[PDB]
């Protein structure tokens, strides 16, 4: 109403503390990171927790992976996505490509695509949406600005339905541009960066909330690991001293 923007809980351990309450409701959050940083995992965990914890239905739009592979790989975290799909609480929308596709001009694919995303959200009454691998849809149209503001048409339309959306995308360097192809220009409201930094010959995973428009959040990088229960962050700064003592 006349209040500051509210947030929806991800229930991703540590993240709701870093974000001071979760992801801003009814807006898009970009999650950008090099290959294998945990973007797709973040975007699945977001939808899964919504279904399991809050009975909020989800739509997962896949541009890179097949739905069969998304479901099979999620078993790694003890998540049965096939059951949720059967129950109608999750819908996986396949926009990944036939190996057999051909030459194109025009970006209208994508108008039809936005309408299918809308229809799915309404059909499943979804409140959470994940869009996986914006980078991939860019590579299919060669970063022509027909994909670029067809992307803005998507971000806009999601905001109109009031969907709360995670969009994942690739970057090439750990400490360099936010997103390959400048994706952060469109998914611009909120930006989360996942890193997999080389410390000598060892890797350290970190998560940073760079920006959340209209609200507060913790700053800088926070280390995390990926476990059999998904992403697990820890809130060094957020800890508080309330604990009791006795003689």
């Amino acid at each position: 109403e006349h209040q500051a923007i509210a947030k929806m809980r991800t229930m991703i351990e540590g993240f709701d503390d870093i974000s001071h309450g979760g992801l801003p409701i009814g807006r898009s959050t970009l999650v950008s990171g090099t290959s294998g940083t945990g973007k797709t995992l973040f975007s699945i965990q977001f939808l899964y927790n919504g279904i399991i914890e809050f009975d909020e239905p989800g739509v997962f739009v896949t541009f890179e992976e097949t739905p069969q592979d998304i479901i099979k790989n999620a078993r790694s975290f003890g998540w049965d996505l096939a059951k949720l799909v059967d129950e109608g609480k999750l819908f996986i929308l396949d926009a990944s490509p036939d190996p057999e596709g051909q030459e194109v001009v025009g970006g209208f694919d994508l108008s039809a695509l936005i309408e299918r995303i809308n229809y799915a959200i309404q059909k499943y009454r979804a409140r959470r949406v994940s869009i996986d691998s914006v980078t991939s849809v860019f590579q299919q149209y060669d970063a022509s600005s027909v994909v670029r503001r067809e992307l803005f048409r998507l971000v806009a339309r999601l905001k109109q339905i009031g969907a709360t959306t995670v969009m994942t995308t690739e970057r090439i360097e750990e400490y360099g541009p936010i997103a390959r192809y400048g994706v952060e220009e469109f998914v611009s409201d909120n930006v989360v960066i996942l890193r997999n930094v080389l410390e000598g010959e060892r890797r350290r995973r970190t998560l940073e909330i760079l920006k959340l428009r209209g609200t507060s959040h913790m700053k800088g990088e926070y280390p995390f690991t990926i476990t059999d229960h998904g992403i697990n962050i820890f809130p060094l700064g957020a800890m508080r001293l309330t604990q009791r003592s006795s003689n």
Partner: peptide
Amino acid sequence: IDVLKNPQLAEEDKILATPT
């Protein structure tokens, strides 16, 4: 077929891109 109207069939066809 209006993708907007029925995205479901598009998905089965794995028809991600438009126009197609």
